[PDB]
């Protein structure tokens, strides 16, 4: 991370794509470094569908400019997701900030 | 402020530390400003150029 | 033009500027050296400034 | 061998030492001829500044050496 | 000796193969 | 004449880093004994570095296991410190077994006679699933300083290895009031290090290395 | 055979190489060679590097 | 494997008079250059046993600033003078020489008496100048075996900077240097040169001497 910034780390690192961030809020049901499982909360839940979020994190893969990006796991298992917040940490990405 | 935060700590305010010198065990004299800088690594590397 | 082309530009400037500069109170003031290596082996030694 | 200064300044051209050291280091390298000064491990071209530099190669020198040779070339062609 | 060759200094393992193939031509056995 | 320093006392304050104290030196030797064996500590103590890692299941460092949340980098690196003991042998290949749910840590190796992990809680990897599995074999070698990869079986996993257990070395010249002679000085250092290498083996033996090497021109 | 010694680096090529650059000089310029003074012959010493 | 060193070759003792010589050490591991370089600096310049002028005595002079005829020079001078006198003595632990002149012209080192065994390495050094007849000194100097460079100010009577150490100036380097295929290890090149009382590399050899003897509780 920075460890001296301005704040706007955060506003940076989630406002571009490369940061896959919760799309219903819920609690985690199992991560893993290639794909993570969310059990969306029954209240934000369609009416029906059953539905559970997947997220397939992108593993080396490369840029236009011959650099490695991939996508690390920052949620444990069981560990309740709000809707909007990160889970898998981009390249140059720390805890959902943007560290260079 | 900056210097109320580096009062929290056990730092001496004004910034600047007395540093020795590792090859000969001397100290320096004038004492000399350490800290924490945040050090990008650009994509100019050495060997793509030669 | 005349000048010359090896003036010793910054780092440099300073070490023999700030070796070769004077204070009016330091270790040492007032003795007498018999020489240049005198001098040299006192300040090496840390008994001179 | 760092400054030819000297050198220079016994052939007091410095395009003319050029054209001397050349023509006495190809001597010196293809052609079989000797050092005239101790060797300590040179390439051919600083020896021929150093042979230069205490005054003992220069452009009459040499003249006069290739026609000596030449000389007793036809000396001994005509044996 | 058309081969692919690593071009001089470029190093490191090799983490991906892909191939692509035309409809038309058998797919060979690492295909 | 001079006296000579002895080996007066060592506090080891903690499980890692210790403080001995060599008494007594003469007017400014403190100085010269210190820097010295301060180089030679950080420069050159015999290590215990792993060196190359084999994983079951994966081809490259560059993949992912199923199960096992890390990729495969972030294990090496995890390995890459982990403080490790030996007694006899040059190099060893310890092997480390696990599955179900929990923190795969350093306590879970395979206990063998000769090697002995000095930090258990040192967590190298996370298993997250029930049929999930991670077994390996972690190479560790002897050797001095540092040497990356490049400069030294499509399973083998390489790592680079940083042998030398001393993390920091500090110390101080205070005087010593003692011998009713006044004017003697007293040199003490603190030693903080990975916890493998014992504070005075490393004092001993940073003492031989400057002697040893101080020796050849002695007589020149 | 010569040239797969120098392609596969050998120990000898090191000594050979620093014979051979012993009093070799080698011209370095920099890219907007503006007057004179923008190329410069120079004695090679063998780096690591 | 992993307590071999390179022990390093020595390759020449360059020498550029009876009291200046340049030692070469190559190779050492790298960064022993500095440690061993350092520690000898340290031992050479501060703490080497030796014997100097420590007090002289005139008998026409009764403070420092005290001024004297027939003389050509002052007494700062004639003080700063008798540092480089380069005494020798044996094994008494001080003694205190004396000199008395009325000559024309130098007043050297050589007419200095021999009231004992104790010597000198350069009879001719200048001790001072008497241009008149009348001109005439007598003094007493006293010589103690010593251990560094003790200042006047940290010590009818006159007191001179004690130099006891043998080594007018030592000062080290670190050249690059390789072996077959290893990266960079050290060259040391030391250039030391001395008073007079002991040639250079036998300064060297005290120096090794006194550090491995004082690490000797460990080996």
């Not at chain 4, 051209?13 to 001829?33: C, I, P, S, T, W």
């Not at chain 6, 110390?171 to 290090?193: F, P």
Request: proline letters at 4%.
């Amino acid at each position: 991370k920075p460890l001296v910034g301005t704040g706007m780390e955060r506003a940076v690192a989630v406002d571009s794509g490369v940061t896959a961030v919760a799309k219903r809020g819920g609690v985690v049901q199992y991560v893993d470094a290639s794909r993570i499982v969310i059990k969306v909360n029954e209240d934000e839940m369609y009416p029906g569908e059953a539905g559970i979020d997947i997220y397939n994190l992108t593993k080396y893969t490369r840029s236009n400019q011959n650099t490695c990006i991939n996508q690390m796991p920052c949620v444990s298992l069981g560990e309740p997701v709000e809707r909007g917040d990160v889970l898998a940490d981009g390249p140059s990405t720390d805890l959902g900030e943007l560290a260079l | 402020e900056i210097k109320e935060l580096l009062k929290l700590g056990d730092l001496p305010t004004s910034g600047q530390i007395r540093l020795y010198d590792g090859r000969t065990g001397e100290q320096f004299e004038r004492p000399v400003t350490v800290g924490y800088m945040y050090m990008l690594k650009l994509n100019h590397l050495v060997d793509d150029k030669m | 033009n005349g000048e010359p082309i090896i003036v010793p530009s910054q780092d440099v400037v300073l070490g023999l500027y700030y070796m070769t500069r004077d204070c009016v109170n330091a270790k040492g003031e007032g003795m007498v050296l018999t020489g240049p290596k005198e001098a040299e082996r006192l300040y090496r030694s840390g008994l001179a400034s | 061998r760092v400054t030819v200064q000297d050198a220079v300044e016994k052939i007091g051209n410095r395009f003319d030492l050029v054209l001397v050291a050349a023509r006495r280091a190809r001597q010196m390298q293809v052609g079989g001829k000797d050092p005239l000064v101790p060797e300590e491990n040179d390439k051919t071209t600083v020896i021929a500044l150093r042979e230069i530099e205490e005054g003992l190669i220069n452009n009459q020198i040499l003249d006069v050496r290739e026609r000596q040779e030449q000389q007793e070339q036809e000396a001994a062609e005509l044996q | 000796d058309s081969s692919l060759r690593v071009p001089n200094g470029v190093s490191g393992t090799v983490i991906d193969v892909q191939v692509f193939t035309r409809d038309g031509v058998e797919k060979d056995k690492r295909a | 004449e001079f006296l000579k320093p002895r080996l007066v006392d060592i506090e080891q304050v903690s499980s890692t880093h210790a403080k001995v104290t060599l008494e007594p030196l003469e007017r400014g030797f403190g100085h010269t004994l210190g820097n010295a064996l301060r180089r030679i500590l950080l420069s050159s103590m015999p290590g215990c570095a792993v060196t190359e890692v084999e994983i079951d299941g994966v081809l490259h460092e560059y993949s992912t296991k199923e199960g096992v949340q890390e990729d495969i980098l972030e294990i090496l690196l995890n390995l890459k410190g982990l403080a490790v003991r030996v007694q006899g042998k040059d190099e060893v290949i310890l092997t480390l077994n696990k599955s179900g749910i929990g923190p795969v840590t350093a306590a879970d190796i395979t206990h063998d006679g000769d090697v002995e992990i000095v930090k258990p809680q040192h967590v190298i990897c996370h298993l997250t699933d029930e049929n999930a599995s991670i077994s390996m074999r972690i190479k560790v070698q002897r050797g001095r300083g540092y040497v990356p990869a490049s400069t030294r079986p499509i399973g083998r996993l390489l790592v680079d290895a940083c042998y030398s257990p001393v993390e920091r070395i500090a110390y101080n010249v205070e005087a010593a009031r003692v011998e009713q002679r006044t004017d003697l000085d007293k040199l003490v250092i603190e030693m903080e290090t990975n916890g493998t290498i014992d504070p005075e083996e490393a004092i001993r033996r940073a003492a031989t290395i400057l002697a040893e090497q101080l020796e050849a021109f002695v007589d020149l | 055979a010569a040239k797969k010694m120098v392609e596969r680096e050998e120990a000898v090529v090191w000594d050979i190489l620093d014979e051979v650059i012993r009093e070799h000089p080698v011209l370095l310029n920099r890219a907007p060679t503006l007057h004179r003074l923008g190329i410069q012959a120079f004695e090679p010493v063998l780096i690591e590097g």
